[PDB]
Enzyme design. Structure first.
Site: not given
Ligand SMILES: *Cc1cc2c(cc1C)nc1c(=O)[nH]c(=O)nc-1n2C[C@H](O)[C@H](O)[C@H](O)COP(=O)(O)OP(=O)(O)OC[C@H]1O[C@@H](n2cnc3c(N)ncnc32)[C@H](O)[C@@H]1O
Ligand SMILES: COc1cccc(Nc2ncnc3[nH]cnc23)c1
Ligand SMILES: *[C@@H]1O[C@H](CO)[C@@H](O[C@@H]2O[C@H](CO)[C@@H](O)[C@H](O)[C@H]2NC(C)=O)[C@H](O)[C@H]1NC(C)=O
Ligand SMILES: *[C@@H]1O[C@H](CO)[C@@H](O[C@@H]2O[C@H](CO)[C@@H](O)[C@H](O)[C@H]2NC(C)=O)[C@H](O)[C@H]1NC(C)=O
Ligand SMILES: *[C@@H]1O[C@H](CO)[C@@H](O)[C@H](O)[C@H]1NC(C)=O
Ligand SMILES: *[C@@H]1O[C@H](CO)[C@@H](O)[C@H](O)[C@H]1NC(C)=O
Ligand SMILES: *[C@@H]1O[C@H](CO)[C@@H](O)[C@H](O)[C@H]1NC(C)=O
Length: 498
Positions: A74, A138, A252
């Site tokens: 993500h 979220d 929020e």
């Molecule tokens: C896609 C998205 C992201 C998102 C969100 C809504 C959507 C549609 N809403 C969020 C929210 O409300 N609040 C918030 O703080 N973040 C929100 N996000 C962002 C999300 O936190 C990030 O995308 C985050 O990276 C988590 O995503 P994911 O689980 O898919 O991790 P990744 O993208 O593959 O990797 C991110 C980095 O972390 C390192 N990594 C991954 N797993 C590990 C473990 N197990 N241990 C150590 N490091 C790890 C990866 O190497 C990469 O650098």
């Molecule tokens: C850290 O604040 C973030 C970062 C990325 C995504 C979100 N939240 C949402 N991300 C995507 N769709 C939504 N609909 C309502 N809230 C969201 C909130």
């Protein structure tokens, strides 16, 4: 070029894949803006396979392969890639059945979860035991290890802190290939480094997550404002400490620009068409170029008196507020339905072909003292005259609930705002325009002297990362990089040491 026995065994068992299908799948992310092919993808069946890879990496002199830990990818700008390296398909850790990868504690005070596990499954396994984590994102289809490498924020963070403030302990494999359990009391330097640590110090294989007794239902309200001063004053009232906080479980907010007001209100999934018509009319009466909405909940359980006690608690709370008279809008749903509300948004968007599109998102933390300046400059300024696709989310956070000894960077002020402008690109020429607009917003902030921090962004200049953490906190970050990833192989897509 010789391989250790345990590394070669991974290739022999079909766990190290170099085929085009494996490498291509690990080469794109949710951002859909940047891509990078790895040399190989590892599909571990156990944490031993991770030990194997990272021990090999550490012991093999001249080892050329960077290693990333893909959660669900993500990331927005390639943070989970390993260009010409090895991507770990973390999800493969939960492939089997024995043993379970999520364990709620006997005493019901925490939940143990594999680093690879997604929060939705953590929620499902928690509710099965009558408990739930206190601090969310979220969107629930993200991994435990992924959100913990960043911070993890939602409407609960003002009172419980981010997800990184709700971890008791972790199992982590460092860049040395050493399995280490860590907490505030054991190997605390690693514990603090990894939390908000952007995958730089090792892989989280297990996280111990604080839970509370699970509420049954959420009373779900939106309040409408045409005056930003009133909107922000009320968000601050709702989230202000009285150690103790007010009744609201979640706070929020969102910004609606006048140009697409009716369509965007309708697209919330919250307002009825009757509600929409009233708000559009209100904006016209006030001659408003922006409209603001506070989104808040009050969690309650299945008790017989619960609903009426909630009505009265809500009535009292709202009477302290200054939203436009009569512009309070209520819903009442199951707690799990509220938490997974964004899943439905994803399904709807993907079926329209509007999910797997470029996401030039802008996410930042803005000091309270400059939020009105940001509103004037951005919501009432830069963004006016543009067609916006995606929510504009704005809400205050309390710094007291953030641990500054952790890697995660925040503004210095007691109160700061999460500002998340979730722009979705309608292809060319919309992507380039959106990337440029994000640059202009950051430019506006720099020139106005607004001391913001980015969130979920990776910088491509050393001076930018130094400024991000702060110089003293940067030196701390580097110290821990030296001890835990001396070869600088881990999560190269952050572009900090790579
Ligand atoms: C896609 C998205 C992201 C998102 C969100 C809504 C959507 C549609 N809403 C969020 C929210 O409300 N609040 C918030 O703080 N973040 C929100 N996000 C962002 C999300 O936190 C990030 O995308 C985050 O990276 C988590 O995503 P994911 O689980 O898919 O991790 P990744 O993208 O593959 O990797 C991110 C980095 O972390 C390192 N990594 C991954 N797993 C590990 C473990 N197990 N241990 C150590 N490091 C790890 C990866 O190497 C990469 O650098
Ligand atoms: C850290 O604040 C973030 C970062 C990325 C995504 C979100 N939240 C949402 N991300 C995507 N769709 C939504 N609909 C309502 N809230 C969201 C909130
Ligand atoms: C969840 O609990 C199970 C036990 O029910 C844990 O499984 C044990 O722990 C490790 C697995 O690597 C082994 O030493 C034991 O042999 C396992 N017992 C068996 C046979 O199930 C599991 O580790 C826990 N998962 C997490 C991530 O907390
Ligand atoms: C809010 O946006 C609407 C556009 O949706 C503006 O209303 C338009 O005003 C122009 C100029 O008088 C008219 O030509 C259009 O017919 C109107 N559009 C529609 C469909 O209503 C409105 O002026 C904006 N308000 C503010 C304060 O900027
Ligand atoms: C973005 O997604 C499209 C369509 O799914 C795909 O063809 C393209 O390769 C992706 N681009 C990047 C840079 O990931
Ligand atoms: C609360 O109780 C109701 C009625 O007994 C039930 O339908 C619902 O599943 C419960 N909610 C939970 C499990 O929190
Ligand atoms: C309505 O608002 C617009 C934009 O802020 C402004 O230019 C105009 O003067 C306002 N109209 C009146 C009568 O105040």
């Amino acid at each position: 070029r010789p391989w250790p026995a345990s590394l070669a065994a991974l290739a022999l068992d079909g766990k190290l894949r170099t085929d085009s299908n494996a490498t291509a799948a690990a080469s794109t992310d949710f951002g859909n803006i940047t891509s990078a092919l790895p040399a190989a993808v590892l599909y571990p069946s156990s944490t031993a396979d991770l030990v194997a890879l990272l021990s090999a990496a550490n012991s093999t002199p001249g080892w050329p392969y960077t290693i990333a830990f893909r959660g669900r990818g993500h990331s927005l700008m390639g943070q989970a890639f390993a260009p010409g390296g090895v991507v770990v398909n973390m999800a493969s850790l939960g492939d089997a059945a024995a043993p379970p990868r999520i364990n709620v504690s006997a005493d019901g005070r925490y939940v143990d979860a594999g680093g690879e596990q997604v929060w939705i499954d953590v929620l499902r396994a928690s509710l099965a035991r009558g408990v739930a984590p206190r601090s969310w994102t979220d969107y629930l289809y993200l991994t435990v290890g992924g959100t913990l490498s960043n911070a993890g924020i939602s409407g609960q963070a003002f009172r419980h802190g981010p997800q990184i403030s709700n971890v008791l302990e972790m199992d982590v494999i460092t860049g040395h290939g050493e399995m280490v359990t860590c907490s505030k009391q054991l190997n605390a330097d690693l514990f603090d480094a990894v939390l908000g640590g952007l995958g730089q110090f090792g892989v989280i294989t297990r996280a111990r997550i604080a839970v509370e007794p699970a509420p049954a239902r959420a009373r779900w309200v939106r309040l409408v404002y045409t005056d930003f001063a009133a909107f922000s004053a009320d968000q601050e009232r709702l989230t202000a400490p009285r150690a103790s906080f007010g009744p609201m479980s979640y706070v929020e907010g969102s910004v609606f620009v006048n140009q697409s007001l009716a369509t965007d209100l309708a697209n919330t999934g919250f307002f009825t068409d009757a509600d929409v018509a009233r708000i559009v009319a209100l904006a016209g009466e006030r001659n408003a170029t922006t409209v603001y909405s506070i989104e808040a909940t009050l969690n309650y359980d299945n008790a017989t008196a619960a609903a009426a006690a909630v009505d009265q608690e809500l009535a009292s709370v709202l009477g302290t507020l200054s939203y436009v008279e009569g512009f309070a809008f209520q819903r009442d749903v199951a707690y799990a339905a509220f938490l997974d509300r964004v899943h439905g948004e994803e399904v709807a968007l993907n079926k329209l072909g509007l999910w797997r599109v470029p996401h030039p998102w802008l996410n930042m933390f803005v000091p309270r003292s400059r939020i009105a300046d940001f509103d004037r400059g951005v919501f009432k300024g830069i963004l006016q005259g543009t067609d916006i696709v995606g929510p504009l989310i704005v809400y205050p956070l309390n710094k007291s609930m953030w641990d500054d000894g952790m890697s995660a960077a925040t503004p210095s002020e007691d109160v700061f705002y999460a500002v998340s402008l979730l722009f979705s690109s309608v292809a060319p020429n919309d992507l380039a325009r959106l990337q440029e607009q994000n640059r202009r917003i950051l430019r506006f902030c720099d020139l106005a002297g607004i001391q913001y921090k980015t969130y979920l962004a990776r910088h491509t200049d050393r001076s930018d990362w130094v400024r991000h953490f702060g110089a003293a906190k940067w030196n701390r970050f580097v110290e821990m990089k030296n001890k835990y990833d001396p070869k600088r192989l881990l999560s190269p897509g952050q572009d900090i040491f790579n």
